[PDB]
Subunit: 266 residues, 6 copies
């Protein structure tokens, strides 16, 4: 539908792919079709061994993602609501599990599923003028795209509760103050400052061992959700996977030869 | 009268205030207060109209100083553990209250007092309020859930330092370590935190009663298990809002550009 | 060997034991020998009945611990690397489980296993000019001393990922900002300002009931890795161990006679 | 009134407390009034210090507990059902947490809440002609008293799913075969064979250290629901509570003096 | 034709059968069979009429021998992990199917085949059927969920012994160790397990569909978290059956003393 | 010399036997025996050639009666806990040994003795051998990890009954409740369990040593967390066998129709 663009950058950004939501007519809302294409694009990247970092952003200035489509929802029977919402929770969850580092570039409004999708990314950067929040309670529903789990985990229980309870919408500076995002930018004339920073942060990842980066992610994500001792065992298991890699040795042969390693993900 | 339960009205309709009023014992958690607190909390657990609860003190300069140190000295060792466990228990029921809860700290909050506040979803305190867990200074440990809720609320390292040092912080410091989410200058009446709490609670009033409750359950429950199980819980909680009249009124209210009229169901 | 010195301070500071890494020629790297001595000291302190607080520091200005020695590593068989790194992970984990309060005085560089050792301590104090990070990914490996677990738990998942993915090194001032350390200050002329602070902090711990302090640490460490309900049960079981102590009585007595308590452990 | 009987036995049964359900007119179903009494009797029994073992049984021949009273349920508006069922669940869980060993004597029908009640007990004894099961699915609902959790834990997930999915009722012998009960025996002329076997089993628990017995239950119940390593720290904290008991020393003293021990709790 | 998905009728209406038809390679989990399997499994997740699913083999004497050994020798080290994980993931989706699942083992079930059976809620096998995880004999380990579901199904001790020894058991032994819940003597047609499966399936058909699904969720999810969280999960699952027409029918039927007639809703 | 650690050979190569030779105390867990046991276990953790470990007593009719009472009665309150923890810690180190472990029970196995056995992967015992946890009869509770390993091994209800009644079971009863995986009639030499253990041990030897090690890790670690994390752990362990020469050998062996010859790596 062209509503979702999957670009593979080059040159200086080689190794970076970008997922851009282009559906201004719907405020980039999650229509039953946009999640299909999203779910489709996500599975594709799951196995894409070339990718080293993934940026998720919008190509519609002023808007990141307004969440689920109110229009379609009001035309859904109760027995259909649950299934559709769970579909969104699952795609958002697959995104949280992408193999490489993920960065959400919020240059605009990010509500409900929009922020939940961003919460699924490893890192979030946003313009100070961007607005985000989970307003589900004002509609007598609750965040249904993982938000009740990821928000408390990212900023703490007390603040995640207050935001969800008051269904308050924060701006870039506020989100930054509560830790919702790790970098607050000054919006530029093209309305893509968050994206530029994300790209910049991404390049910063490109020079590392592809295999080490992926298992580092796995150790962090998996370990945080089990007791520390099991987490340590998981760290050992991920570390073991970097040992028989050419890259491990290429790393050593690069510093001994005083030269930038040329990792291949092997 | 050592425990006041007020159902506010008009603009504050839906807000219930639990006020500790034991000036004589510095609002210490005596056997009696603990009993009345438990009755109060259980009754509210089943109250259908409440949309937010505020826990505060009706004695200026004092939130709650903790367990009655006098009664403790009059308990045999075999009675200590059971008693302290009753404190840990009631404080845990407060943490599980169905609706949003706000602790208004306008005075001293020590031991069980601070733990009581920790059981609340949100904490608001005056700058001049003093709070801390000084159990280690008495050769014991926080026993009202503090060893669990303090590290969870501000991180392990800071929680450990505070407990190991038995340090007491003022409102400003509490805000700085994230022990509370709102801090402000005490006012002439000595109820600044309470006034602020009231304003914050009003912000919760307009939301769907059913969704607010299951939202609380998904957060409290989900945070204590792996994320995947958490998502399943979020799914089971969301599912309960679908067949509610409220959910429909929300979509209707949105379509008729007007304020939603929620009644729970 | 004087590579790992164990000082048992006394009078005014009695109860405080200082563990000093002194391997200037190797930047306090975790050589095979060091971990062996470290493990012996840790295990010794484990059962020491007079300790009340342990401070871990370097006696080498500008260097806390550079992490795993890159020399010895480049000389290991792929089947040896794993077990070596695991020994580091294990000892660092024994430090995490020391029975009493532990403080890390970071007056110098803390990289890889060095920062991981500091993470294993209960509290971290550092100089603003001190550097620290986990740059493993740059070498196509991941943190192996527990970093993938403790870093995310201490400063949050997103920031921990950003630091590990980019392999960024922070200074004390930045570490404070992200909550990596609890106390930051300006290095003094002696180059031991973190240490002075650590010492001052440890002294705040001395007056408290020794038994209560140990089970408080047990309740917290253990409770943070399980559900809150079980954590409450743990707190109860830990509290129970303070009820039949002489110190608990002394405490209620001191309070009565309005005087300073005199604790002896039991 | 006498719908719930609490008896404090003596002579050779001193220490055994019997809780008998006596509501024949309603098949001992869990009516609003019966759950209240049960909750009161349960709450009081926790703080009870002389109790050494509790037996839950029925004063009515051929019937243990039919579960919830379908009469009241039909008169309950949808908004009242969930809260009432969670109350049955909570009380049954309190039964699961009683301090001393618990034994369910099943001399009759045990359906739904009745069986869930028996599952909250540490040990289940039943007449071979006793019938028991969770038939909620035949009513388009699910076990609501902890059955979805306790049945799978007690006899395994596969067998638990089959019983709940088919809403099958088993007899005492098939219950023993699937491990639902520990002891099964031929019913006697009195119709209280299970109860008699429970008393004998109970008497086997009396001669043991009361404190050790209690913390042992805590250690078993709590450690089973968390990772094993945390479970080991829980065992540690529980063992500690027996160390400063006079009973521990009595045990050692009784062994030396080759004579039966005389414990008193403390 | 390698994967037949049937929607039975008559007395079996509501039962869906997924049959593996690849005698060519002992129903081995080839790249194609896996893609087809995943497509069908995903399709069944949204199938709103199915009330129970049975997984079986349409090839007498063989259930599924596991991953295709021929294809494996052609994969690079970098291709193995991904492929094995795909299998582990598809087997996990089967384990998460909304309705009751029954594995009918009338033949050989090795590695992925036995792991596939472990993903089903219930297993029935002919006494002459052989099954096991022999990965260790090939210097690898069960990679389809076996190291997790086997210990959970039969216990740690027995699972390690089977995996350490890479031993193959027959239906009778599988019954003895609790690996299967139902064992029967095989028949000429070679489909005795499938026949028993259908009969068991029919036992499930009359129950409330919504209650059946949330019961399965409560059991699967609660089992992998602490008991208390598990009770909260049960509460949330039970709540979803409260506002259903089926639940009122259940009560109406009991009062009219007739068999209830459920429709999901 | 109270603990012999021998590395067998000729058909038994790869098997190491751990023998408790301390009859003057019923093989009780003395400070000294614990020190030695801990040293052996820690040494075995790096022994690159071992493929299976057997723990048994070289004293007829006795496995291990647990901690030594004589020493205990000489320890002050402050020393018991630390010592008991030391027992729990070493027994836990045994549960974590890298290779399959079999406990050969040919005699009395009480307290720490049975607990040590519970730490092994598999338990074999003579029908006449006796074992149990009688701590509660001494006013204490199992302190070697029994409160945790027993319930997990035979179920909560049974472990509670055994611990509460401080009952002693014989090999036959141990088999019936699942406490042990194999029971034999004792032989004239009084080492029937040992011979069984050796035979069972020899069945492990041919398998890929790397795969065996990571198989145990997947099983032990996966069983203590949620299934999903467990599947992730299995993936990480599976991944380690991919770049091994043993895996390739396994496939080549099959192809050339000949028994595989693994050397680890």
């Amino acid at each position: 539908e062209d509503e979702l663009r999957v670009r593979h950058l080059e040159e200086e950004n080689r190794g970076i792919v970008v997922l851009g939501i282009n559906r201004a007519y719907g405020k980039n809302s999650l229509s039953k079709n946009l999640i299909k294409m999203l779910s489709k694009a996500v599975d594709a990247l799951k196995s894409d061994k070339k990718v080293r970092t993934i940026i998720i952003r919008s190509e519609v200035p002023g808007i990141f993602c307004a969440g689920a489509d109110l229009k379609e929802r009001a035309k859904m029977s109760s027995s259909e609501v649950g299934p559709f919402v769970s579909k969104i929770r699952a795609v958002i969850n697959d995104i949280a599990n992408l193999p490489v580092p993920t960065i959400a570039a919020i240059d605009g409004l990010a509500l409900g599923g929009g922020l939940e999708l961003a919460l699924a990314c490893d890192i979030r950067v946003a313009a100070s003028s961007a607005k985000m929040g989970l307003v589900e309670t004002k509609l007598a529903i609750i965040p249904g795209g993982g938000g009740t789990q990821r928000l408390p985990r990212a900023i703490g229980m007390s603040l995640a509760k207050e935001l969800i309870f008051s269904a308050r919408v924060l701006d870039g500076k506020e989100a930054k103050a509560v830790g919702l995002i790790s970098h607050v930018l000054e919006q530029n004339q093209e309305g893509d400052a968050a994206y530029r920073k994300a790209l910049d942060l991404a390049r910063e990842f490109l020079p590392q061992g592809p295999v080490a980066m992926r298992v580092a992610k796995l150790a962090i994500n998996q370990g945080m959700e089990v007791d520390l001792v099991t987490g340590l065992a998981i760290e050992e298991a991920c570390y073991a996977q970097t040992i028989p890699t050419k890259d491990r040795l290429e790393g050593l042969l690069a510093f001994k030869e005083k030269r930038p390693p040329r990792y291949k993900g092997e």
